Amino acid sequence: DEAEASKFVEEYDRTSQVVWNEYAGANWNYNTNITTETSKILLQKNMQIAQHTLKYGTQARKFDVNQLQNTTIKRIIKKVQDLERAALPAQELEEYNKILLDMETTYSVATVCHPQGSCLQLEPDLTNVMATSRKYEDLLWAWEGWRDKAGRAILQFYPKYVELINQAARLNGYVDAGDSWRSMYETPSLEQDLERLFQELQPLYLNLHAYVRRALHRHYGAQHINLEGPIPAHLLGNMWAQTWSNIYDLVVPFPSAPSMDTTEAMLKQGWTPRRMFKEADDFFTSLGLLPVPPEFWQKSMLEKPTDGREVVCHASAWDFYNGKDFRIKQCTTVNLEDLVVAHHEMGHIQYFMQYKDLPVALREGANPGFHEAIGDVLALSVSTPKHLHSLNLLSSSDEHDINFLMKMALDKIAFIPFSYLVDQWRWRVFDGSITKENYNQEWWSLRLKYQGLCPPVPRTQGDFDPGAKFHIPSSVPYIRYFVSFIIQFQFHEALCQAAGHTGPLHKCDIYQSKEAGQRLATAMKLGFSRPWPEAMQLITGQPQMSASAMLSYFKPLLDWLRTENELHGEKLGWP
Ligand SMILES: *[C@@H]1O[C@H](CO[C@@H]2O[C@@H](C)[C@@H](O)[C@@H](O)[C@@H]2O)[C@@H](O[C@@H]2O[C@H](CO)[C@@H](O[C@@H]3O[C@H](CO)[C@@H](O)[C@H](O[C@H]4O[C@H](CO)[C@@H](O)[C@H](O)[C@@H]4O)[C@@H]3O)[C@H](O)[C@H]2NC(C)=O)[C@H](O)[C@H]1NC(C)=O
Ligand SMILES: O=C(O)[C@@H]1C[C@@H](C2CCCCC2)CN1C(=O)CP(=O)(O)CCCCc1ccccc1
Ligand SMILES: *[C@@H]1O[C@H](CO)[C@@H](O)[C@H](O)[C@H]1NC(C)=O
Ligand SMILES: [Cl-]
Ligand SMILES: [Cl-]
Ligand SMILES: [Zn+2]
C-alpha cells in the first residue's frame, strides 16, 4: 500500500515535469505571439496535458487516502485526485478550452477608437489616459469605450464558461467552482475570516473615500460630485478604480511640499524596462535571496514588442517546471507604478526558484495570497522616500510624512474593497445566486456597497463590465489579492522587526537585511507542503491573518484624515 503510493508520486512527478514544461512553452508562445498557428498548437497541448491529468488522476483516486501513513504522499495524492477541467467529457473539455482561449484573446486584442481617429489599446494607451487625463469627458470616453469593446464582447461566452467550470468542479467533488477555489486555502472559516478583515479596514477606507471625494468635488465641479454619494468610477486614475495613486496630484495633503516628477526623473536618467527588473533583482539579492538565472534575461518579454506581434500584455510570471526556466511577460512602462509591478512579478519568480526542488504538486504558495504578497513586501521598502532618493528619483517633516502615507494609501487602502468584491461576485455567479439576467446589476451593487462607486454612464442590457477586468475572462481567482494586501503588511512589520527597525512602521526599509531575507526564504521553501499557518508563523511568529499591521502602518494617516474630514464636516459613506 505505502510502497505503491510512493512509487506513484515518483512517477507522477517525473512525467508531469515533461508534460507541464511543453504546455507552458506553447502557452507562452501564444501569449507572446497571438496567431492562428500558436493557438492551434496551444489547444493541442491542452489535450496532451489533459490526457496526462486524466491518467494519473484516475489512478490517484484508486488510493484510499485515509489508509496512507506518510503525510506528504497523502497530500500529493489527494491533490492529484482533482482532475480540474480534465474531468469533463471530451466534447465539453474541447468547448471549455475554446471558450477560455476566445475570452482571453478577446480581452487582450480589444481596442477603443476615437471617433474617426486612432484606436487605442489598453496598455499603454488607455492606461495612460486614465492615469493622466483630468478631463471628465475624456476619461468617460476611455472608461465607457473599454467596457463597450472588451466587456460587452465577453458576455457571449460567460454563461457557458460558468456551466462548464462548475460541471468540472462537481465532477471533482465540489458543489461549484467557487467552492473549489476557496478550498485552495484549506480554511473552513475563510468567508468569516475575510469578512472580519474587511470590516477592520472600514474606518480607513471610509475616511480616505470622503477625503478624495472632497478633492474631486474641488476639481471636477459641484454639479458632478455628490458630497454624500458614491464617486464616479472613472475619476480615480485607474481603469477599474482599484488603485488611486495616479490622482495623488489632485489630493495632496500638503501641497507646499513640491512633488518631484518621478516618471520624468526615470526617463531623464535613462531608466529602461531592463533597468527596472535589474533593480528588483538587486533588492532580492540584497536580502540574501536568489538572483534570477541568466536564462531569465534572455527569454523574458519585459516590454511590448514593436514587430507587429499581438501579445497578452497583462503582467504575469511563468514557471516552466524544469527548475531552471522562469520568465516574466510584462508590457512594462518606465514609471514608478510599473516599477512596483515589476517587483510584484519578481516576487513570483523568487517563489518559483525557492520551491523548485519540491514535487511539482507542491510547487505553489502556502496559499495563493502568499504568492501574491512576496514582491509587494519589497516594494513597500522601495517606495519609501529614503529608497527612492537613493535611486535619484526624489529630492532629499510631518508634511512630507503625511504626504507619503497618502500616496501609499491611495493604492493599498483603496484596493481593499475592490479586491474583496471581485470574488464575492464570482462566488455568487458560480453558486447560482446571480444569473445572466443580473450579472451586471449585481456587479454594480457590490461596486456601490464595498467601494462606494457609481458608473458615470447608466449601464444597459448587453453590458458585462466584469468582462473588462482581465481576471474575469482569464478565469484567475481574485481573493488572493485581498489576502495579499492584508498579509504583506504583517510580513513587512515582522521583517522590519527582524532587521532591527525601530519607530514608525512606514519608515522601515529592509534593503540588504539578511535576517529579513532568511525569514522569507524559510517560508517560501515550504511551497504548498504544509498548511499555510505554518508559513505565517515562520515569518511573523504567529499563525493568523490580521489587519493590525496594516492599521499600525497607516495610523498617522487615520488620525490626519479624521481631523481633516471633521474640519470640513464630511458625511462618511454613501446613504
Ligand atoms: C514522507 O515522505 C517524504 C517524501 O519522501 C520523498 O518522496 C517519496 C515519494 C520517496 O521518493 C522518498 O524516497 C523521498 O525522500 C519525506 O520527506 C523527505 O525527507 C527527507 C529526509 O532526509 C528529505 O531529504 C533531504 O533532501 C535534501 C535535498 O536532497 C537534502 O539536502 C537533505 O540533507 C540535509 O540533511 C543531511 C543530513 O545528513 C545534511 O547532510 C545536509 O547538509 C542537509 O542539511 C535531506 O537529505 C527530503 O527532502 C524530503 N522530501 C520531501 C518532499 O519532503 C518524509 O521524510 C517522509 N516522512 C516520514 C515520516 O517518513
Ligand atoms: O493587475 C491586477 O489586478 C493585480 C494586482 C496587481 C498588483 C501589482 C502591484 C501593485 C498592486 C497591485 C498585480 N496583479 C496582476 O494581475 C499581475 P499577476 O502576476 O498576479 C497575473 C497572473 C495571471 C495568471 C497567470 C499566471 C502565470 C502565467 C500567466 C497567467
Ligand atoms: C509568431 O508566430 C508565427 C506563427 O507561429 C511565426 O511564424 C513567427 O515567427 C512568430 N514570431 C515571433 C517573433 O516569434
Ligand atoms: Cl467596472
Ligand atoms: Cl485565490
Ligand atoms: Zn501576482
Numbering used by the authors: 40 to 435, 439 to 617
Publication excerpt:
Human angiotensin I‐converting enzyme (ACE) has two isoforms, somatic ACE (sACE) and testis ACE (tACE). The functions of sACE are widespread, with its involvement in blood pressure regulation most extensively studied. sACE is composed of an N‐domain (nACE) and a C‐domain (cACE), both catalytically active but have significant structural differences, resulting in different substrate specificities.
Here, we report kinetic data and high‐resolution crystal structures of both nACE (1.75 Å) and cACE (1.85 Å) in complex with fosinoprilat, a clinically used inhibitor. These structures allowed detailed analysis of the molecular features conferring domain selectivity by fosinoprilat.
